[PDB]
């Protein structure tokens, strides 16, 4: 289920209430995170339980949380780089209703996308490298996309 | 059905989801987990449209074509820029642990996920982490096994499963760990395994006999040709590079083979390429061997022939019918001989007379399919026939196909129907001499000798019509079974009955017919499938001719003393010595064939006829289909001194050279015309395929792509100055990519499929009218007869039970896909395959000799003592042998035959 | 909107003005990516439609081409006429700056349309080699013979079914031809080549060839002589034909690149620009401003080898031998920056479908600065000692003039039209490339085109060339040399090496070709000789389904008997050197 801040407590435990709010009752047994735990390492430690409870018959969920569950470890270490967030928007945008065979990747990716909406400066803390996919190779010249 | 695709309105099946509507109308949707054969599952999620509710809609969802059913009214795109975008996105996902391996893969240039890569313009790669990888397994010697490929889309389970029937491929572990094999190391089991070198889009399944020679898509040089390794008549694409037979590929038709060989065909090929093989004309004086070009050998055979006072031609089931009716014409017609044996041609031509005079209509491959319940009398057709098999395999799941319809469920909804119908399944009733492949799906198998399976067979048209002769003597518990049969079969609007000419029984194939007949004078839907032996079997039948003993008798008694032997090794079908003798014998023998025979030794002529890949012609199969088979590639554009010619054309020339001293060649249409001259019931063979003349908007059909490379280079060392491009005076294809091979043009022979962003075998779809339909224009091949307006009689005959006589050994045929075939033994990679030859015993009939399992036992067959080891087999009936019929020294002519003096050596 | 797009060009105020006048029925509007309104005309209205054009307030005075198309194999015609084979005219006018392309739908059994030769005089020749390769007959020829192939050629080779390769060499014809060649001086009739009064009793015959001892190329004239005046001269071309449209048809778009160097063979760059430029079209490619830049400075580069070659040869076909010694030093400095930069001299095969082959090498500014110092004062000698020598204005001033109306009826393009005031330059009428951001004038006559104002001409473009490398040399852009479109053939060549996305979008493309989506387009630009321009017809596949390639050299020889008549030979001699011509441009 999607996070909910402090503001959200005073809101009916109903599946409509919760439903409006932009996250789901779900089995109405919720769980309270503190300011010591971080939230970047909390939503890694959630898809990775989630990337590693994929039943592997469908592509986005069997090969899209495991991307999102490296870029979450290499934000939690301070290696993230410039469109990992945007990768992981990309990743909650298309592991929705619809795009995956069950039901499974849309509850993985609600956590993901509702910790971003609301802790986006945890994230973003996160990304410190630039941005590299290539090694030089000695001869070419490579195209400097600007 | 009316769908609306991107502001365009088309009209489509109902029936048929939105992938396969849009993909027949010429539309390019990305998709890797749906196969036509297969159905939908839904897995891959590449094939994604935006649905839209109403015409008035803009937001729209995004929905799986392949599981959306295309009904009345339906609007969807497939260029809107969300749906493009996850496309996109599911190619890069399934992108991220591709290994790095397209210059060393063998898929590259002929993969799938490489043209649905650069079909969504994936071309930029931003994922900077680790790549997962596996370890691979042996399969065996025909697939190579490389997991680092896969991207899981599930199709070779679901084939190899679902529909092959296989059990030894499965998927293994979890969430990106699927790894797709065998629980172990070891062969695939199944016979239908080679068609996951094209169901897999990646390159996981490859062909290992042609990983060997390697050569790209690109540089191949293909034609439409007839598989010669028995009598279906599965149509195939042989590709050559550098003067040999680099691949088999499967050539859609659907009326025949659609998408799937067996293994015996797709792997088989290897003989083309044997070093042994004659390659110039040899003329034996005395010890010596001297080499003739092709008028040296017509001419001093022609004097020679001219000599001689009767000389007989001996004709094979190999050969093309153009071949056969050149060597008749040549020898005359009462001198010339089918080369199979005498019980051979009295059962091949009681199939055909069943066939086109029985008055039940005998159904194409693909049309097997489509029937209800299916006996099957005497013939191991996992063995014999495969693919036959494998459509009775279709046809018996057609019940779940039945039961999910009743449901309102898609028949493309391939999960949802298997789920509905759990195990149940068409009835299934197979007769063997031991158990069979089919055993499984079996709803019943009997394993008895060939007389009981008979004698089944006519107690079941006795019970079905009483009008049938009856079978005396029939055990209670077997006539319980006959009534579980009788009552399956007289419930089912479509039966099919299948026997054929490998049980070596002739009352089999009465049976088999009495059963048809009964059935059909209930007012069934009843059909009738006789599986010959050989790739132009049927054709043989249909010409005629003496048999193989009336001419090893001509020439023992000195009538004949001139024999011209085509594309036959005589030991199949006659007993070596009287064979070798007979030869011996006669002061001329000429063998005009494409392997070393061993009857080449007493041969005075040899002339280098040409294999299926070097030569054209028309083979009927056993469903009296003639298809025409065109040359592959020039022999001769290499190796300058190679004289290999057409059979035909060198029984032709012999004749012409015969009559007016002068060489004439031929072209391979005025053969054609002759045939349908002389021989009215091969009529048909003329409307196999177009004439020479034919054309494409003035141009030839390409036997090789566009992008065909190396053509300064490729003979470069032998001479720097390019030789002139082989002329094809025969076909309407030319030897070079100066032709067309548009998927919209007007043609049904189609070498190999390709299309601009498809270089799989998905540009089949781009061929087709319909998606896994039938060809745009028509399939290839047209049936030489029609079904008959009446029928024939029953068969009085009723055998008597079979009865273990002492001291005497009825031969049972044990059928092997590897190893029963002539020419696919030849082929080395078939060897490793190949079983080591062993005898099958009865334990009763082993404890009674007193031998265990493994140990050698010699027998004596035609004053003849060989050895082998022994099984112990449970199946086989007491006072019976098992053979392997085909191998290395046992002829199918021993299948019914007596064994004495049988005992451990 | 990109420029690239598929555009039906409806707001044209042509296409309102034939509606006006034929009828809503009388034609069809094709959307292409061309850039131009393409008219599907009626075969019976060609003419009527051709004088309507020729007659506007800002008339169309130009046929620029005029070909045919074998549509026997097209599939993707939807939004067309039925046809079998079809002709196309390339009609432009400079007052509107606008062009027009009407199409001729023909059946298989009708291949014969009304001639154009009476509207516009280049079509004679466009129209004979239609007929030679294509099998269309025009009604009305003066005579339609063959122009590229011999006349005792069978078959029509551009057709779909004709066979591109070589055939087998055969001694025997080579004899026969011998024959031929060896009898055709004394079997010389003179109204199988559209002359009349063959030998008033005085009216000599000469040849000119075909062993032709200059750069320009080997092909023949006949003469009609009067003592030393030319009456009539007929060019006899084809000698140099390559196939190259033909090898377009067998080529897929990347692997071609090499053959649209050797169309013009002093051009280079400028003959590989066009047709990039047209399969980005294609493509739907926008190239960087860097790759822009680049393209600008290669093309310059081998515009200002081919003037000094141009001038050069001039001064030596004059008879001053020595500076062509110079000039040639010269054009091995600009061969030194163009060896450095794309590893070749006269074929560098350099560009790419979105982009360039490789990035510039490091120093090749230091290069650039070093021709730059090294060009003016060796082009200032060039001047006084040959250009301003009055023995070589005696030869060449005066010499086959013609004016604007003849220039413009004969398709004349590049410095001959010019030299008559005309103001028609592609880099500044239609922009390309880039061209807009570099500041260079456009040299023009007085109004008559001498063989000495075409060589002055020339001479000032060579200066605004060197302008325009000035400001390339300052204004380097930093950025990619290949465009980030996923039909950039072939990918950036780092990522191919280690990225498997990448790597397979290379693999296909260099293997079985990159797929162009079924278009037309067309590219016009300013080559070193005139305007040249590629006009593509992609069927979907990765081979071009046809390559129109239009050269000037072709329209200027055209238009030589025109110009001539009337003069002496060794004025036929200068006014050869003046052209600025190449026979595989003319040929092709
Ligand atoms: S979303 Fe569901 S069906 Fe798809 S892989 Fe994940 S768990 Fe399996
Ligand atoms: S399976 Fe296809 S994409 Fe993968 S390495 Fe092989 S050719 Fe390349
Ligand atoms: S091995 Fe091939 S067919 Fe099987 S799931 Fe993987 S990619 Fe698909
Ligand atoms: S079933 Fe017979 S004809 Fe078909 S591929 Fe196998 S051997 Fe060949
Ligand atoms: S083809 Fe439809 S999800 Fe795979
Ligand atoms: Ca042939």
């Given at each position: 289920?999607?996070?909910?801040?402090?503001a959200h407590?005073?809101?009916?435990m109903?599946?409509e209430?919760?439903?409006k709010?932009?996250?789901?009752?779900?089995?109405?047994?919720?769980?309270?995170?503190?300011?010591?735990?971080?939230?970047?390492?909390?939503?890694?430690?959630?898809?990775?339980?989630?990337?590693?409870?994929?039943?592997?018959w469908?592509?986005?969920?069997?090969?899209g949380?495991?991307?999102?569950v490296?870029?979450?470890?290499?934000?939690?270490?301070?290696?993230?780089?410039?469109?990992?967030?945007?990768?992981?928007?990309?990743?909650?945008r298309?592991?929705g209703?619809?795009?995956?065979?069950?039901?499974?990747?849309?509850?993985?990716?609600?956590?993901?996308?509702?910790?971003?909406?609301?802790?986006?400066?945890?994230?973003?803390a996160?990304?410190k490298?630039?941005?590299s996919?290539?090694?030089?190779?000695?001869?070419?010249?490579?195209?400097?996309?600007? | 059905?009316?769908?609306?695709?991107?502001?365009?309105?088309?009209?489509?099946?109902?029936?048929?989801?939105?992938?396969?509507?849009?993909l027949?109308?010429?539309?390019?949707?990305?998709?890797?987990?749906?196969?036509?054969?297969?159905?939908?599952?839904?897995?891959?999620?590449?094939?994604?449209?935006?649905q839209?509710?109403?015409?008035?809609?803009?937001?729209?969802?995004?929905?799986?074509?392949?599981?959306?059913?295309?009904?009345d009214?339906?609007f969807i795109?497939?260029?809107?820029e969300?749906?493009?975008?996850?496309?996109?996105?599911v190619?890069?996902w399934?992108?991220?642990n591709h290994?790095?391996?397209?210059?060393?893969?063998?898929?590259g240039?002929?993969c799938?996920?490489?043209d649905?890569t650069?079909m969504?313009?994936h071309?930029?790669?931003?994922?900077?982490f680790t790549?997962?990888?596996?370890?691979?397994?042996?399969?065996?010697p025909?697939?190579?096994?490389?997991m680092?490929?896969?991207?899981?889309?599930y199709?070779?389970?679901?084939?190899?499963?679902?529909?092959?029937?296989?059990?030894?491929?499965?998927?293994?572990?979890?969430?990106?760990?699927?790894?797709f094999?065998?629980?172990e190391?070891?062969?695939?089991?199944s016979?239908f395994?080679?068609?996951?070198?094209?169901?897999?889009?990646?390159?996981?399944?490859?062909?290992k006999?042609?990983?060997?020679?390697?050569?790209?898509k690109?540089?191949?040089?293909?034609?439409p040709?007839?598989?010669?390794?028995?009598?279906?008549?599965?149509?195939?694409?042989?590709?050559?590079?550098?003067?040999?037979?680099?691949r088999?590929?499967?050539?859609?038709?659907?009326?025949?083979?659609?998408?799937?060989?067996?293994?015996?065909g797709?792997?088989?090929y290897?003989?083309?390429?044997?070093?042994?093989?004659?390659?110039?004309?040899?003329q034996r004086?005395?010890?010596?061997?001297?080499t003739?070009?092709?008028?040296?050998?017509?001419?001093?055979?022609?004097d020679?022939?001219?000599?001689?006072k009767?000389?007989?031609?001996?004709?094979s089931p190999?050969?093309?019918?153009?071949?056969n009716?050149?060597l008749?014409?040549?020898?005359?017609?009462?001198?010339?001989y089918?080369?199979?044996?005498?019980?051979?041609?009295?059962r091949?031509?009681?199939?055909?007379?069943?066939?086109?005079?029985?008055?039940?209509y005998?159904?194409?491959?693909?049309?097997?399919?489509?029937?209800?319940?299916?006996?099957?009398?005497?013939?191991?057709?996992?063995?014999?026939?495969?693919?036959?098999?494998?459509?009775?395999?279709?046809?018996?799941?057609?019940?779940?196909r039945?039961?999910?319809?009743?449901?309102?469920?898609?028949?493309?909804?391939?999960a949802?129907?298997?789920?509905?119908?759990?195990?149940?399944?068409?009835?299934?009733?197979?007769?063997?001499?031991?158990?069979?492949?089919?055993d499984?799906?079996?709803?019943?198998?009997?394993?008895?000798?060939?007389?009981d399976?008979?004698r089944?067979?006519?107690?079941?048209?006795?019970?079905?019509?009483?009008?049938?002769?009856?079978?005396?003597?029939?055990?209670?518990?077997?006539?319980?079974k006959?009534?579980?049969?009788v009552?399956?079969?007289?419930?089912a609007?479509?039966?099919?009955?299948?026997?054929?000419?490998?049980?070596?029984?002739?009352?089999?194939?009465?049976?088999?017919?009495?059963?048809?007949?009964?059935?059909?004078?209930?007012?069934?839907?009843?059909?009738?499938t006789?599986?010959?032996?050989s790739?132009?079997?049927?054709?043989l039948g249909?010409?005629?001719?003496?048999?193989?003993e009336?001419?090893?008798?001509?020439?023992?008694?000195?009538?004949?003393?001139?024999?011209?032997?085509?594309?036959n090794?005589?030991?199949?079908?006659?007993?070596?010595?009287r064979?070798?003798?007979?030869?011996?014998?006669?002061?001329?023998?000429?063998?005009?064939?494409?392997?070393?025979?061993?009857?080449?030794?007493?041969?005075?002529?040899?002339?280098?006829?040409?294999?299926?890949?070097?030569?054209?012609?028309?083979?009927?199969?056993?469903?009296?289909?003639?298809?025409?088979?065109?040359?592959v590639?020039?022999p001769?554009?290499?190796?300058?001194?190679?004289?290999?010619?057409?059979?035909?054309?060198?029984?032709?020339?012999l004749?012409?050279?015969?009559?007016?001293?002068?060489?004439?060649?031929?072209?391979?249409?005025?053969?054609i015309?002759?045939?349908?001259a002389?021989?009215?019931?091969?009529?048909?063979?003329?409307?196999?395929?177009?004439?020479?003349?034919?054309?494409?908007?003035?141009?030839?059909?390409?036997?090789?792509?566009?992008?065909?490379?190396?053509?300064?280079?490729?003979?470069?060392?032998?001479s720097?100055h390019?030789?002139?491009?082989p002329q094809?005076?025969?076909?309407?294809?030319?030897?070079?990519?100066?032709?067309?091979?548009?998927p919209?043009?007007?043609?049904?022979?189609?070498?190999?499929?390709?299309?601009?962003?498809?270089?799989?075998?998905?540009?089949?779809?781009?061929?087709?009218?319909?998606?896994?339909?039938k060809?745009?224009?028509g399939?290839?091949?047209?049936?030489?007869?029609?079904?008959?307006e009446?029928?024939?009689?029953?068969?009085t005959?009723?055998?008597?039970?079979?009865?273990?006589?002492?001291?005497?050994?009825r031969?049972?045929?044990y059928?092997?896909?590897?190893?029963?075939?002539?020419?696919?033994?030849?082929?080395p990679?078939?060897?490793?395959?190949?079983?080591?030859?062993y005898?099958?015993?009865?334990?009763?009939?082993?404890?009674?000799?007193?031998?265990?399992?493994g140990?050698?036992?010699?027998?004596?067959?035609?004053?003849?003592?060989?050895?082998?080891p022994?099984?112990?087999?449970?199946?086989?009936?007491?006072?019976?042998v098992?053979?392997?019929?085909?191998?290395?020294?046992?002829?199918?002519?021993?299948?019914?035959?007596?064994?004495?003096?049988?005992?451990?050596? | 909107?990109?420029?690239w797009?598929?555009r039906?060009?409806?707001?044209?105020?042509?296409?309102?003005?034939?509606?006006n006048?034929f009828?809503?029925?009388?034609?069809?509007?094709?959307?292409?990516?061309?850039?131009?309104?393409?008219?599907?005309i009626?075969?019976?209205?060609?003419?009527?439609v051709?004088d309507?054009?020729?007659?506007?307030?800002?008339?169309?005075?130009?046929?620029?081409?005029?070909?045919?198309?074998?549509?026997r194999?097209?599939?993707?015609?939807?939004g067309?006429?039925?046809?079998?084979?079809?002709?196309?005219?390339?009609?432009?006018?400079?007052?509107?700056?606008?062009?027009?392309?009407?199409?001729?739908?023909?059946?298989?059994?009708?291949?014969?349309?009304?001639t154009?030769?009476?509207?516009?005089?280049?079509?004679?020749w466009?129209?004979?080699?239609?007929?030679?390769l294509?099998?269309?007959?025009?009604?009305?020829?003066?005579?339609?013979?063959?122009?590229?192939?011999?006349?005792?050629?069978?078959?029509?080779?551009?057709?779909?079914?004709?066979?591109?390769r070589?055939?087998?060499?055969?001694?025997?014809?080579?004899?026969?031809?011998?024959?031929?060649?060896?009898?055709?001086?004394?079997?010389?009739?003179?109204?199988?080549?559209?002359m009349?009064?063959?030998?008033?009793?005085?009216?000599?015959f000469?040849?000119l060839?075909?062993?032709?001892?200059?750069?320009?190329?080997?092909?023949?004239?006949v003469?009609?002589?009067?003592?030393?005046?030319?009456?009539?001269?007929?060019?006899?071309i084809?000698?140099?034909?390559?196939?190259?449209?033909?090898?377009?048809?067998?080529?897929?778009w990347?692997?071609?690149?090499?053959?649209?160097?050797?169309?013009?063979?002093?051009?280079?760059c400028?003959?590989?620009?066009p047709?990039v430029?047209?399969?980005?079209?294609?493509?739907?490619?926008?190239?960087?401003?860097?790759?822009?830049?680049?393209?600008?400075?290669?093309?310059?580069?081998?515009?200002?080898?081919?003037?000094?070659?141009?001038?050069?040869?001039?001064?030596?076909?004059?008879?001053?031998?020595?500076?062509?010694?110079?000039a040639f030093?010269?054009?091995?400095?600009?061969?030194?920056?163009?060896?450095?930069?794309?590893?070749?001299?006269?074929?560098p095969?350099?560009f790419?479908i979105?982009g360039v082959?490789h990035?510039?090498?490091?120093?090749?500014?230091?290069?650039?600065?070093?021709?730059?110092?090294?060009?003016?004062?060796?082009?200032?000698?060039?001047?006084?000692?040959?250009?301003?020598?009055?023995?070589?204005?005696?030869?060449?001033?005066?010499?086959?003039?013609?004016?604007?109306?003849?220039?413009?009826?004969?398709?004349?393009?590049?410095?001959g039209?010019?030299?008559?005031?005309?103001?028609?330059?592609?880099?500044?009428?239609?922009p390309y490339?880039?061209?807009?951001?570099?500041?260079?004038?456009?040299?023009?006559?007085?109004?008559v085109?001498?063989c000495?104002?075409?060589?002055?001409?020339?001479?000032?473009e060579?200066?605004?060339?060197?302008?325009?490398?000035?400001?390339?040399?300052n204004?380097?852009?930093?950025?990619?040399?290949?465009?980030?479109?996923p039909?950039?053939?072939?990918?950036?060549?780092?990522?191919?090496?280690?990225?498997?996305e990448?790597?397979?979008?290379?693999?296909?493309?260099?293997?079985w070709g990159?797929?162009?989506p079924?278009?037309e387009?067309?590219?016009?630009i300013?080559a070193?000789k005139?305007?040249?321009?590629?006009y593509?017809?992609?069927?979907?596949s990765?081979?071009?389904?046809?390559?129109?390639?239009?050269?000037?050299?072709?329209?200027?020889?055209?238009?030589?008997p025109?110009?001539?008549?009337?003069?002496?030979?060794?004025?036929?001699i200068?006014y050869?050197?003046?052209?600025?011509?190449?026979?595989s441009?003319?040929?092709?």
């Open positions: 289920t999607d996070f909910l801040t402090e407590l005073d809101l009916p109903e599946f209430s919760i439903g709010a932009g996250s789901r009752l779900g089995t109405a047994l919720a769980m309270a995170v503190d300011h010591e735990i971080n939230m970047v390492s909390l939503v890694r430690n959630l898809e990775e339980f989630f990337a590693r409870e994929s039943c592997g469908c592509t986005p969920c069997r090969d949380l495991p991307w999102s490296k870029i979450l470890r290499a934000l939690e270490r301070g290696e993230g780089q410039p469109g990992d967030i945007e990768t992981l928007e990309q990743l909650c298309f592991l209703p619809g795009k995956t065979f069950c039901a499974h990747a849309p509850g993985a990716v609600e956590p993901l996308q509702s910790a971003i909406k609301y802790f986006r400066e945890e994230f973003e996160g990304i490298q630039p941005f996919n290539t090694h030089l190779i000695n001869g070419i010249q490579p195209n400097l996309l600007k | 059905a009316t769908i609306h695709v991107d502001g365009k309105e088309y009209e489509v099946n109902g029936a048929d989801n939105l992938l396969e509507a849009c027949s109308l010429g539309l390019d949707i990305p998709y890797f987990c749906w196969h036509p054969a297969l159905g939908s599952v839904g897995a891959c999620r590449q094939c994604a449209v935006k839209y509710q109403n015409a008035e809609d803009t937001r729209g969802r995004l929905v799986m074509s392949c599981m959306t059913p295309a009904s009214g339906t795109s497939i260029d809107d969300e749906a493009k975008q996850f496309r996109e996105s190619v890069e399934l992108m991220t290994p790095h391996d397209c210059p060393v893969c063998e898929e240039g002929n799938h996920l490489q649905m650069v969504t313009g071309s930029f790669r931003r994922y900077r790549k997962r990888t596996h370890r691979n397994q042996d399969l065996g025909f697939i190579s096994h490389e680092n490929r896969c991207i899981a889309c199709r070779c389970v679901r084939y190899y499963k679902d529909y092959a029937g296989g059990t030894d491929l499965g998927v293994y572990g979890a969430h990106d760990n699927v790894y094999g065998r629980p190391d070891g062969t695939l089991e016979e395994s080679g068609n996951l070198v094209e169901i897999c889009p990646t390159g996981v399944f490859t062909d006999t042609h990983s060997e020679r390697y050569n790209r690109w540089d191949m040089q293909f034609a040709s007839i598989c010669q390794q028995c009598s279906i008549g599965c149509n195939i694409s042989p590709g050559e590079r550098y003067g040999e037979l680099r088999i590929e499967n050539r859609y038709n659907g009326t025949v083979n659609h998408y799937f060989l067996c293994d015996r797709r792997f088989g290897g003989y083309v390429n044997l070093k042994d093989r004659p390659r110039q004309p040899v004086r005395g010890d010596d061997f001297i003739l070009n092709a008028e040296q050998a017509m001419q001093g055979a022609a020679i022939l001219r000599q001689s009767k000389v007989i031609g001996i004709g190999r050969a093309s019918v153009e071949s009716f050149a008749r014409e040549l020898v005359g017609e009462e001198n010339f089918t080369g199979i044996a005498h019980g051979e041609q009295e091949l031509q009681l199939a055909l007379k069943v066939l086109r005079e029985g008055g039940i005998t159904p194409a491959l693909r049309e097997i399919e489509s029937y209800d319940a299916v006996l099957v009398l005497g013939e191991d057709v996992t063995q014999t026939g495969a693919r036959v098999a494998l459509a009775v395999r279709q046809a018996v799941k057609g019940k779940a039945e039961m999910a319809a009743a449901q309102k469920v898609a028949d493309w909804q391939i949802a129907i298997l789920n509905i119908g759990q195990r149940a399944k068409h009835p299934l009733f197979v007769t063997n001499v031991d158990d069979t492949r089919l499984d799906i079996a709803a019943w198998t009997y394993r008895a000798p060939v007389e399976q008979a089944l067979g006519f107690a079941i048209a006795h019970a079905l019509d009483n009008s049938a002769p009856a079978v005396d003597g029939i055990e209670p518990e077997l006539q319980s006959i009534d579980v049969i009552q399956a079969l007289a419930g609007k479509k039966p099919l009955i299948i026997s054929g000419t490998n049980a070596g029984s002739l009352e089999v194939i009465q049976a088999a017919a009495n059963v048809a007949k009964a059935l059909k004078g209930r007012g069934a839907d009843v059909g009738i006789m599986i010959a032996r790739v132009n079997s049927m054709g249909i010409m005629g001719g003496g048999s193989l009336e001419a090893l008798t001509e020439l023992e008694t000195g009538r004949a003393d001139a024999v011209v032997v085509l594309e090794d005589l030991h199949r079908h006659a007993s070596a010595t064979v070798n003798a007979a030869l011996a014998k006669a002061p001329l023998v000429m063998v005009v064939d494409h392997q070393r025979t061993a009857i080449m030794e007493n041969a005075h002529l040899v002339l280098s006829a040409a294999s299926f890949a070097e030569s054209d012609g028309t083979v009927i199969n056993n469903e009296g289909r003639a298809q025409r088979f065109f040359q590639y020039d001769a554009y290499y190796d300058s001194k190679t004289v290999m010619l057409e059979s035909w054309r060198w029984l032709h020339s004749h012409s050279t015969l009559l007016s001293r002068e060489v004439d060649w031929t072209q391979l249409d005025h053969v015309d002759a045939v349908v002389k021989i009215p019931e091969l009529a048909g063979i003329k409307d196999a395929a177009p004439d020479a003349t034919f054309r494409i908007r003035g141009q030839k059909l390409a036997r090789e792509p566009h992008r065909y490379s190396g053509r300064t280079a490729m003979r470069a060392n032998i720097v390019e030789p002139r491009q094809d005076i025969d076909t309407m294809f030319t030897f070079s990519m100066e032709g067309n091979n548009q919209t043009a007007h043609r049904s022979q189609v070498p190999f499929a390709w299309a601009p962003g498809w270089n799989s075998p998905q540009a089949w779809n781009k061929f087709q009218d319909e998606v896994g339909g060809l745009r224009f399939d290839p091949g047209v049936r030489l007869f029609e079904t008959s009446n029928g024939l009689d029953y068969f005959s009723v055998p008597a039970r079979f009865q273990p006589q002492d001291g005497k050994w031969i049972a045929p059928y092997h896909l590897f190893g029963s075939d002539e020419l696919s033994q030849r082929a990679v078939f060897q490793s395959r190949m079983p080591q030859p005898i099958k015993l009865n334990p009763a009939d082993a404890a009674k000799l007193g031998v265990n399992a140990t050698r036992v010699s027998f004596s067959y035609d004053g003849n003592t060989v050895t082998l022994v099984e112990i087999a449970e199946g086989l009936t007491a006072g019976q098992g053979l392997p019929m085909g191998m290395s020294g046992i002829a199918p002519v021993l299948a019914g035959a007596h064994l004495e003096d049988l005992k451990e050596a | 909107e990109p420029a797009q598929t039906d060009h409806l707001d044209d105020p042509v296409i309102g003005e034939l509606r006048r009828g809503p029925d009388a034609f069809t509007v094709q959307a292409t990516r061309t850039g131009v309104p393409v008219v599907w009626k075969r019976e209205q060609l003419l009527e051709g309507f054009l020729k007659k506007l307030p800002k008339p169309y005075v130009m046929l620029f081409d005029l070909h045919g198309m074998d549509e194999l097209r599939t993707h015609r939807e067309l006429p039925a046809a079998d084979f079809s002709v196309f005219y390339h009609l432009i006018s400079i007052d509107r700056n606008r062009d027009i392309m009407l199409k001729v739908a023909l059946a298989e059994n009708d291949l014969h349309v009304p154009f030769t009476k509207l516009f005089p280049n079509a004679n466009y129209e004979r080699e239609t007929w030679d294509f099998g269309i007959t025009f009604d009305g020829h003066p005579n339609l013979r063959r122009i590229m192939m011999p006349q005792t050629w069978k078959g029509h080779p551009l057709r779909k079914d004709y066979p591109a070589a055939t087998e060499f055969s001694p025997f014809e080579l004899t026969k031809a011998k024959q031929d060649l060896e009898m055709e001086a004394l079997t010389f009739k003179p109204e199988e080549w559209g009349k009064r063959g030998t008033n009793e005085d009216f000599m000469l040849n060839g075909p062993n032709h001892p200059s750069a320009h190329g080997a092909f023949r004239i003469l009609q002589l009067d003592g030393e005046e030319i009456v009539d001269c007929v060019p006899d084809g000698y140099h034909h390559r196939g190259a449209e033909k090898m377009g048809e067998r080529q897929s990347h692997s071609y690149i090499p053959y649209t160097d050797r169309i013009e063979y002093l051009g280079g400028v003959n590989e620009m047709y430029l047209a399969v980005e079209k294609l493509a739907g490619i926008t190239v960087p401003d860097r790759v822009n830049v680049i393209r600008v400075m290669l093309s310059e580069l081998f515009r200002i080898n081919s003037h000094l070659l141009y001038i050069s040869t001039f001064i030596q076909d004059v008879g001053a031998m020595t500076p062509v010694f110079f030093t010269d054009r091995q400095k600009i061969y030194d920056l163009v060896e450095a930069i794309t590893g070749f001299r006269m074929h095969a350099w790419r979105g082959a990035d510039l090498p490091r120093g090749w500014d230091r290069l650039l600065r070093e021709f730059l110092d090294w060009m003016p004062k060796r082009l200032a000698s060039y001047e006084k000692a040959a250009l301003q020598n009055t023995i070589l204005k005696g030869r060449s001033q005066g010499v086959a003039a013609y004016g604007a109306k003849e220039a413009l009826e004969w398709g004349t393009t590049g410095a039209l010019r030299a008559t005031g005309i103001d028609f330059d592609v880099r500044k009428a239609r490339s880039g061209y807009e951001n570099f500041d260079f004038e456009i040299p023009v006559g007085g109004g085109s001498d000495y104002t075409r060589v002055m001409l020339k001479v000032e060579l200066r605004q060339s060197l302008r325009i490398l000035e400001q390339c040399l204004n380097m852009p930093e950025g990619p040399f290949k465009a980030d479109h039909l950039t053939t072939p990918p950036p060549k780092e990522r191919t090496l280690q990225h498997i990448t790597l397979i979008t290379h693999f296909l493309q260099v293997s990159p797929v162009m079924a278009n387009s067309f590219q016009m300013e070193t005139g305007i040249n321009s590629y593509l017809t992609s069927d979907g990765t081979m071009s389904y046809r390559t129109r390639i239009r050269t000037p050299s072709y329209a200027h020889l055209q238009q030589i025109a110009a001539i008549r009337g003069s002496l030979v060794s004025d036929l200068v050869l050197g003046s052209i600025d011509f190449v026979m441009d003319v040929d092709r």
